[model samples]
Target: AMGASRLYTLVLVLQPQRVLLGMKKRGFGAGRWGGFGGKVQEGETIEDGARRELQEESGLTVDALHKVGQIVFEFVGEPELMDVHVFCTDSIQGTPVESDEMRPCWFQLDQIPFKDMWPDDSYWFPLLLQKKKFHGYFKFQGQDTILDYTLREVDTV
Candidate 1:
């Protein structure tokens, strides 16, 4: 069984020809560079939750959110799936300011520090850059060890 899996969202800002990510200052992805977002509330739509998470985490909001990819992650001994919905946007409303949960910043295409991100990020991040859709499954032994996985470009999830 996938156990008690819950839905989470990840929204990224792609603007001025760069990717805006945050240094996760606390919680699950602490100490890593990633896009802005978090768990989805029961009454919220996916994009609505995406919008809310971005604002809460980075003080940034965008007009149109593009759904780019999805990942279902399984940790070796964990019981639940860490399912994540991926989103992107080019039009934004305010400057990316930091919050208690994250420190916001932008990076050049070639300057993203993958080493500081979740192991699975490297597999699907490229698909997001190519404007392609994808669905991936990743299994991990722990924070820094990805035991197995498969990722591919797809027309839809």
Candidate 2:
């Protein structure tokens, strides 16, 4: 709670009534179904990091990304929080191709598999689908158990 946190991005590709998600194959959130993005590299803006991570994980690119939300994740006993900027895009180039890091899939708006996703997702994802911006903080005991959190819609992210 008192140390520098890492910056990351979470990008969701939106279609008419569905959203694209990736099943993480390994690393931090492995085995979870979530947006496509990761650590922001040096020398690039956060938006740039979103685009790069999206393309890297799902083989998709976007010209414009809408800032929809932000979430700070903290795990018990860890000093650093994961400062995640969440974004969504309805217009994209290239199909969602599976990569070593993720398996791309689309889900109906009402059918997001929250049980297989990080617990924090269920709270904000609904706000996101409603075209609302939000921000929240979640404290977890481990990867699967969220101990505390707060979420609310906002006028701006």
Candidate 3:
């Protein structure tokens, strides 16, 4: 099958306690603390889009980045599919500030308030904290629920 729908996600890590995340303004599940990222815009490379999203959502610019993994899956009860590329960076410059869409702030990694995040976040975030690369899929009927999914670790070449 030909892959069509795609998204690029960036996992922006700071000294967790120093970061603060905002809630979605409108949606079925409106409020939550999550990372800064979004869909890849047209004509933009995943790397460029990742950096652009970091700047746009958190006002931070990363020095270096690498693609760690990807996930492809079908949406529950929908003909649409999704392909997500995951990227990460160790160093960033600039201060994170609140934007109209995202209010960026920091919290300690050990104290991340997962209670205010999506259900699936708790499933994978810990692995990410361990610096493990992964690929995963979420079959969602709508926000706040996962119909089913799968996850796996990808060995880097």
Candidate 4:
């Protein structure tokens, strides 16, 4: 991948015991189990992008959201560095309905299938579960491997 930068957004719908995730059906990060999220379209705010992606993928509208985290993901042999803005919410409307992009589902907090998601998710996802803010950078050597990374809690995102 040629060196490039892009901004994306991710939304985690949370409840006291579980969070909603999706089994990606195609495209980048395909076959992964992760949140409802995607690219930020031109003229859209990060929050709006997150919400749009969520609704498109899961058919749920964010009732309220908080900017909880940010992460920059870099692949060792790829030039594209993905700058991801992360948001979380405990409230939402509509039942989650699967889309062409993803198979939406919910998982218990202790039952997150991190092994089926991005390699870096296990490192930062806990912060979201704890309602903590965070900022992180992760460099991946290859699929399912983190070459170098830093993740820390923040007082505020």
lDDT of 1 by residue, 45-68 (tens): 988999899999999866568899
- Residue-by-residue lDDT tens digits, candidate 3, 29-71: 5677877677899998888887888788878778556776676
Question: TM-scores of the models, in the given order?
Answer: 0.94, 0.95, 0.83, 0.92
- Model 2: lDDT to the true structure: 0.90
- The ten-residue window of minimal lDDT in model 2 covers 55-64
- The superposed Cα distance between candidate 4 and the true structure at residue 110, in angstroms, equals 2.5
Model 4 regions lying over 4 Å from their true place: 1-4
Report the C-alpha lDDT of model 2 over 1-157, residue by residue, as the tens digit.
3767899999988888899999999888889999988899999999999999998888887767899999999899989889999999999768999999999999998788999998888899888888899999999997888888988889978
Q: What order do candidates take by TM-score, descending?
A: 2, 1, 4, 3
Candidate 3, poorest ten consecutive residues by summed lDDT:
13-22
**lDDT per prediction?**
0.86, 0.90, 0.69, 0.87
Model 2: lDDT of residue 73: 90
Q: Which is the better candidate, 2 or 4, if ranked by lDDT?
A: 2
Best candidate, lDDT-wise?
2
Q: Which stretches of candidate 2 lie over 4 Å from their true place?
A: none
Candidate 4 similarity to native, TM-score: 0.92
lDDT at 77 for candidate 3?
Answer: 63
Clashing pairs in 2: none
